[model samples]
Target chain A: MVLYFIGLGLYDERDITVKGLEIAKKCDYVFAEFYTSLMAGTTLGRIQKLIGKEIRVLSREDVELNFENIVLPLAKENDVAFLTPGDPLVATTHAELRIRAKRAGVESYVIHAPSIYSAVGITGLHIYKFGKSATVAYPEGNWFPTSYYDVIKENAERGLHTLLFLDIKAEKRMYMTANEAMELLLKVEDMKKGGVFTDDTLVVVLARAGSLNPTIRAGYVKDLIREDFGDPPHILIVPGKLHIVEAEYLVEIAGAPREILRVNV
Target chain B: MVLYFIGLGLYDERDITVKGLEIAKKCDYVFAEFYTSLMAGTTLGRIQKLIGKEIRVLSREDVELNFENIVLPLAKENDVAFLTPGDPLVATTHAELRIRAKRAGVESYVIHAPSIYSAVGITGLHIYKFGKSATVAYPEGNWFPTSYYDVIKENAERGLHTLLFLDIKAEKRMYMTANEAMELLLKVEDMKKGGVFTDDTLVVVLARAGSLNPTIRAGYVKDLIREDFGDPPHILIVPGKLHIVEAEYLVEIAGAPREILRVNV
Candidate 1:
């Protein structure tokens, strides 16, 4: 008579909370969807091993289209868990899905894990100073999205950092690299002739956050644009004004250029 | 030969990730600090039982002043884990602690967990739309801090949302409820008169996030100012220009008034 929305967290199967795992272990039916920010660190088999349950993986279409038809009906009679990468409602559509559960007369609870949104805090930036976030999408066909460019600009103007989520088409296994995101931002600057993203722009790239040895690099875009961040599922951060401590971390931990250490007071 | 900085996540012992739990279990010594934000849902004994280690609880001074002296010295010889309430580095001071580890020649790794920062996504508001965040500090000794009010106005002017973290003095057991935060904001509005937070301002309060029955309520301050939202550790969100979907989730899932479903322009 209840449905639980559990998060697998970032990077791995082990990223799921103990609370989430314990509940899932006792659940009668467990379903997971990976297309929303896929956990690149662990496999479905490993996740099943941890839960000790035969898990059913749902595709994006299966979840977005038939979540109620497939998952809600099971909840009416059983303790059902719908697992997703990161926090379930952190993804836009999942919030609406809960409304479906409410209408279906099934109770729902959320079990959260680490999300890239908060995981970026690992970059040594103050989470409070982050401004409005945007997605850096790969320009396809005649559509080139540059709103992310303006996002960085607005944030910088306010001395607030902007978190730019690299675009991903998870179904196609296509993940936009931070390098790609930077290139697109530079392209946006060229087309708009705005100084939103230029060679001298300072940016931070964090790849595979929630991992012990994930790559954290900070430098001017020109110097680091072609630099490899390694693997898919990358997140990019464009910081505006830096606190001295923030600069020191970027320099010491992230190997940021020493020049970044000298902030204008 | 390594030091691990892990997060216990929010609310409870089970909130720790499987990765963090497994790592903590294998560690030779475990230490924790709760002054940043205390886990209200569980106790030290429960956390120790879950990890099977006797956790030495550290105060803010112990961590701030003696992290290297207390935690780093032991880390050189044995695997040591230092646990915090949320993601370790997410707290501003903790990031600098990693520098202490680096200088002490102790290799340190961070294990991530859910934080109230990302847990706010449970509000069903788009995370990207959240602008800057601030703590609603108690006005003491003729010191009235209302910069949080300016944050709301700035975010609202840009059609973004502002996340207000209520004040808390864990050792003193002084937790500022959402109602108190509203009263403070209303006072700030009266003083600054920027009209940031008012009786008619729509606000959302999330209490005891990461728990089974979190209090998610949305309404005007006039209706909710005197309303009780359960316990401590509440977060307030002042939304600017709600989207239709966001309104629906707030209305349907969070028990927000149905009048919010109508978005102007």
Candidate 2:
């Protein structure tokens, strides 16, 4: 008789919260979309196995265009759950869907899980220092996006860190790697000549965020651009001035260059 | 032989992620501190019953001062878990505790859960538009804290949302309500005369985030200051220029004044 927007959390099926899983298990039908963000470490079969329910995987169009028609219709009479990777609302359109649910007179509740937004805390950067975030999108024919670069510049001007979500075409099976995002930023820098993103800029890369022994690397763009961060679903962080403690954590725990303590600090 | 920093998530015992609970259940000893953030919907006995483990509660001093002496020694010989209300490291000293674990020859792993930082997404604001966060502190006899005011000012100037964490005296079981925070902001405005927060200023209040029917209200400070939001662990948000979608969501979902669609949007 209600709709549940449940987050599957980061990395794997097990990352879903107990409340989320419990509610999801009892739902009459469970529908999920992976186009917003894909779980790098788990498959649909694995998640279905954990929840012990057959999940009807949804496409971006199936959700964005026909959510009220497809999902809400069932919600009026039966319990329906819509699942997404990471926290249901962060960097996603589930909020709009919730609005649509309200318009359809279908009551909805959110079940949150760990998101990459907070998972970045594992990189040792103070979450409070993070500023307005942006996404690095791949440019198509005559359509180059430079707003992500400007976002980093704006955050840096305020002495705040910028979280850059790499673009993904989940349907096309395309996931942007950190190396490619850096190259795109360098290209934008060459055209704008703003020096917002140069090879010397210090950046942090996180891969497989929820997995044990996940990669947490911090160094100059030039040094990390070609270096393998291992796996997709990578996120980049352009740090503002680093605190001494943050620098120490990066150097000791994240294997960042010791020189960052003096330079970026 | 390992230390796990697990987050209990927001609001209640059921908020613990399946992953966090599975790992926590296997730990030889579980210690927790409530000084960071309060879980208003559940008690210690409820959480212990959920995980089937007796939790040794720690004070602020115990965690900040004697964590190494007490928790780390146990981790050397047995699997130990340190639980906090929200995500393990967001706005907490658990990261530095990881450093201490390294020094004590103990390997540490962070098992993340939902945090108020990302839980703000439930308020219908675009999470990426959020800027650097600030905490409102309780003013004492001689000392006053107003940095949180400046944070909202800075974020507003950049057309970014500000997430203000209200102060908590967990030892005394006192949590700052959004009303008190608004009053303090009004006082700061009177002193600074910067017009950062006024009676006419629009704000958002979210209470008991993880609860199924938690309060979500938004309007001018004057109207909301007297409105009861139903319990402790209240968070406030001062939005910048709102997108039409954001305004509409606030109006439709959070029950904000309809005029905000025209004014704040």
Candidate 3:
């Protein structure tokens, strides 16, 4: 009688750990939700085929409000698995689900996996140097959000990099690409006039991480604002200055402009 | 011809992703190092058995001094794999190895896995709120390192949590435990008198994180100073202000003091 929160790692079905898959193979039921983030690499059919279970998809409204109503009931006497895109609770409000499990007289455990939060290291930016994180949201009518702009400015003033997760509407299959995010930031900059994000600012665009040949590009926004980075589910990084080694890796590994080798220092 | 940098996930051999294991099994030569961090869950022999290959263990001296001498030589003709404990380039200086691969006419691809940086979501704190991670290193007798103190203060001032990775000297088999890290922070407080860390401060200790039942304790330093957290490879978090939801999971799941449910908010 237990519940397991397993993470399907970045990219594809095979990204799930042997540890995560083995136990999932033996579980009585498997439940998953993709409302948090989209997986650009694999389909639900492939994940179901790999885990060898009848996978049931849950809605965000259901899981967030009625976890005790559905999944925890199965955990009362059977082994139940709740799968998510990344580490189950990372970057989401799902940590409250563990409390739901406890209140229902059920026990829940987290199985870890690779997250975009840590995958930013693939950009050649030091993971420890990342200061604070903010998301670029799709501006709604009468509700243009600019808090993300402030976060970038604060992290830059502290000499620390900022990771900006592009917004995603998983249900509609709509994604806010790095190009769109840059456009939004520039609009915010035009209004705020803080020079936080400008045509002169250098940013890193990492698209389709967890793939072996995922796109890694770095340059001033003016040059890269319209570059086709391929596919959905991309991340943008506004770096705060650079260590020589950081710049060297960016140039050689990420194909950053040679000027960044001299200019952003 | 090519090099693959794969991450062995948090604690064990099975923690390797299905993709990583499948790639590693096909490689002509496999190399790994434990100097960056140790896996408290699996032995080298077990990992070799799982991959169905002879795994050559490398040292920090071997890798840092002569990666070209030992590993890249085989990469010239054969597909070689270099394995590390977590995501390959996350916390370590190994990102530069990809550059070395380039200079030697060998292309490299990174295989992602779970890292403690993202795995801290297990502690019930919001992951995006974490900022500017630092290590709690031991004194070399002549050198007393307390830079982590200011990192905590800086993040706290911005309403962000700080993740403290305790130090590890894999060569000496010395891992700085959670208790030791707490003591070190208290000592730093005495010297700096900056009120960054004190007996009255609240902290979270996570030990043996990847295991089924990890030790997750949250309370004041005075209450948990000498509390047993099970084993080595611990991490501590100095949180700033807490949201009501953040404190609830800490109180319920981590066995935090009931009063923090009210006090922290």
Candidate 4:
């Protein structure tokens, strides 16, 4: 008996690899961990309907506690699948799981797929130039953290790209908007002596990746805040330092104004 | 005149999106940048043959320097297409070209496609957990700076996933092996006092993504160094922190050994 940890790449149900599709079709029990990343245009119900399989969705607590007794034993006795939105083991939990399974003598297999971060490369920023990603939490009574400024500053110091993923709490149906996140940065910049994020900073916002109507726009933070970017799951890109080409592309393709950019010569 | 950037996703030429295909068919001049990443098993010759079009193969320099002399004017005068492996604008050069076209008053459109980095999500890692990506440069005569270490340490500290793209210099047929990368990390651990990455630190190595015969392995750095994962264009994932389910999936799916891992109580 083998446990298959599969990654259902970004997009609809059809994005699952042939290997993943085949394994999911045959697995006795298929459970998905849903807290990490959400699919572009897919839902639990749609996935089950498309695959014609019964999928038990596991929450953060369910996976953290009952994994050993419920999940592992199933893999030991019969074929089981623990699925994830993107690649399963890309998260630290999955890597740790593989270690535990090896100790338990449970055989395992991985079926690869696309990840959400893959969209970073689509931005014309060198994939290798990105720095640590940060998420902006909801402001506490209008209070915001200034630490993001340091992170952005450091990434810029090295000419790396910074990917900002907004916070999302599905249980509460709360998702951070790009405007709200930028507002936090804008506030922190106002208080700082050196001014971290300026109104002229070239910020790129992407709405609804993997969907048919994905909208990408680049402009100053001040102007971007006013633009009506629709939907959730939006990603904000504040590139650290731009290679010469990156700066140019931002202006031409993303409507980034050249006067504000620090071009890499 | 319009400038179009098209991405050829993971499989054959047909892997390009319907939008990309349509644009390629109508474009007057088509140029492809092919060196940065692998094109599944397909080659430039094969892609051109499959598309039934003669595409101008742009060298790294051509994309970087000759763009003004060759590419810009054509984009201004006629509809032009820039073909890239994976997604087009993912490269900074594409961005640069876009800026140039915008300055030249040539309108542009980007037709996106799936890229390999996103494949990590398919591996089941938390896409948001990924930090900055770094390339594993070939060790040159003991002059290896701890650049990779810096990137890994930063990601680990922030509980972000680090996607280590194995170095591939296609023109020279030079690719860094995963074993060499691990051994380098071990050397860095010996020299650096940072406690984050030790010999026992968990690492995930994937080889030949998007190919039929792909390899995914999860284990300690020392154990991974001992394993001979065949092929080039490999990717190494160093997990930062773990969500319990992610840990469990890793052990069960990727054969990560227990005893080396600790579950947070």
- TM-scores of the models, in the order given: 0.98, 0.98, 0.99, 0.70
What digit string (tens of lDDT, one per residue) describes model 2 on residues B40-158?
A: 89999999999999999998899899999889999999999999998988854667788899999999998889988888999999999999999999999999989999999999999
Candidate 3: where is the Cα deviation over 4 Å? B263-265
Model 3 C-alpha lDDT per residue in residues A125-191, reported as the tens digit of each score: 9888899899999889999999999999999998899999989899887999999999999999999
In candidate 2 the C-alpha lDDT for residue A156 amounts to 95
Candidate 1 lDDT (Cα, 0 to 1): 0.90
Off by over 4 Å in 1: B263-265
- Clash pairs, model 1 backbone: none
What lDDT tens digits, residue by residue, belong to model 4 across residues B72-138? 7898889898888776566544666666676778877766665666655545466656777777776
Tens digit per residue, CA lDDT, model 4, A105-168 = 8976666554546665546667777776667767667566567677777677666677887776
- Model 3 chain A: worst 10 consecutive residues (lDDT sum): A85-94
Candidate 1 C-alpha lDDT tens digits along A1-265: 8999999998999999999999999999999888778677999899999999989988888888899999999999999999998877674468888889999999999999988888887788988999999998888899999899888888999999999888778778998999999888888999998777899988999999877799999999999999988997899999989999999999999999898889998
- Which runs in model 2 stand beyond 4 Å of their true positions? A263-265
Question: What DockQ does predicted model 4 obtain?
Answer: 0.30
Candidate order (DockQ):
1, 3, 2, 4
Whole-model Cα lDDT per candidate?
0.90, 0.91, 0.90, 0.71
Better of 3 and 4 by TM-score: 3
Residue A10 error, candidate 4, Å: 7.1
> Mind giving the per-residue lDDT tens digits that candidate 1 earns over B1-265?
7999999998999999999999999999999998899999999999999999999999999999999889999999999999999777888788899989999999999999998888988888988999999889999998998888889999999999899988889888779999999998999899989877888889999999989989999998999999999987899999888988889889898888877776421
CA RMSD of each candidate after superposition? 1.1, 1.1, 0.9, 6.0
- Per-residue lDDT tens digits of candidate 2, residues A1-265? 8999999998899889999999998999999999988688899999999888999988888888989878899999999999999999999878988889998999999999999999889888999999999999999999999999899999999888999999999889999999999999999999999989998998999998877677999999989999999988899999998888788788888889888778543
